[PDB]
């Protein structure tokens, strides 16, 4: 399983971006989420969605501006973040937990800047 994080880069206030997250590579099923980290912080909690894509959660600091979504045919999960803050620049991870082995995988991680 490798999951490959693309989208991101620098961003003006305000704007919006779309991440996005291709897993590759049997098949189980996963818990997708996002993850940021900013520099000399703690990893934190952006969002995730269920394996049937029925529930989602998402940190107090997004909620209501980002949408976190499944694309099945392009095994793809997004995050889509509007009215971006310089408190949102961080590295953004995807990570994939998987339910069945109950083993995690991680992303590259993407960076977003946002000036």
């Known amino acids: 399983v490798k999951l490959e994080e693309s989208g991101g880069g620098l961003v003006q206030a305000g704007g919006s971006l779309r991440l996005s997250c291709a897993a590759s590579?049997?098949?189980?099923?996963?818990?997708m989420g996002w993850f940021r980290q900013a520099p000399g912080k703690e990893r934190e909690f952006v969002a995730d969605?269920?394996?049937?894509?029925?529930?989602?959660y998402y940190a107090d600091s997004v909620k209501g501006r980002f949408t976190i979504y499944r694309d099945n045919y392009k095994n793809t999960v997004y995050l889509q973040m509007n009215s971006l803050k310089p408190e949102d620049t961080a590295v953004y991870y995807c990570?994939?937990?998987?339910?069945?082995?109950?083993?995690?995988?991680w992303g590259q991680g993407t960076q977003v800047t946002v000036s």
């Open positions: 990570n994939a937990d998987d339910l069945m082995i109950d083993r995690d995988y």
């Open positions: 590579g049997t098949f189980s099923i996963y818990t």
């Open positions: 969605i269920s394996w049937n894509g029925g529930s989602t």
